[model samples]
Target: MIVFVRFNSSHGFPVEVDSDTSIFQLKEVVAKRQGVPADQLRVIFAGKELRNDWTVQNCDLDQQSIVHIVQRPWRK
Candidate 1:
């Protein structure tokens, strides 16, 4: 089931993703919009970062979720 997901930033946007897929696809999709490499973008959900296990439905983080999109060297 493909659906829109919110990726937060100062200028956030929604990217459509397969609810059954992992962040691999979501990252790539967002990267294309931002004109950056997928590896350069990190997905943060709630208050934590993601790993390979992160998926829309698997994490139960579908349209209800508001994930943050952060670049590297991020406030660390």
Candidate 2:
């Protein structure tokens, strides 16, 4: 199944991914599109940073589900 994730940003782009893909893969794709490092991107679902192993297949991402996206705050 495909999951539609709601993104929060100036762009507020919605990304659709396979339920079988890892959360990390979403991070990678976002990074690739935003020109950022995968490790530097941050994705939070239900107030927790999504783990690399977290799969949409097992997660509760209903039609109304939401996923927040933000670049890691840069440290001076």
Candidate 3:
């Protein structure tokens, strides 16, 4: 399956991902472009947290999938 995600950031960049990719992998890719850490990343799908080990092949994140990505709380 093919998925498209539109992220609201300064860059306004969108991504095309595959169903075989894990949410963690998506986080890594986003973090690489956004300059953040994968472990420090969080993804929300339809207001629900995504399981790290969950793959798109299992979940089938399609057009109805609403994804929101945020960084983990920082320690000062």
- TM-scores for all predictions: 0.56, 0.51, 0.50
User: Considering summed lDDT, which 10 consecutive residues are worst modelled in model 3?
Assistant: 1-10
lDDT, candidate 3, equals 0.47
Kindly report which residue pairs in candidate 1 clash with one another: none
Distance (Å) between predicted and true CA of 14, model 1?
1.7
Top-TM-score candidate index: 1
Q: Cα lDDT of all candidates, in order?
A: 0.51, 0.49, 0.47
Tens-digit lDDT track of model 2 for 1-76: 3333434454544455532235566565555454566646566554455654453434555654445555443335
Query: How well is each residue in 1-70 modelled by candidate 3, as lDDT tens digits?
Result: 2334334343334455531246666565555554556646564443445555454435546643435555
Decoy 3 TM-score against native: 0.50
Candidate maximizing lDDT: 1
**After superposition, candidate 3 runs with Cα above 4 Å error:** 1-12, 18-23, 52-57, 63-66, 72-76
Q: What is the C-alpha lDDT profile of model 1 across 1-76, one tens digit per residue?
A: 4344334555655555542235675566555554666647575544456544644456656554555555332232
Angstrom error at residue 8, model 1: 7.2
Candidate 3 backbone collisions, by pair: none
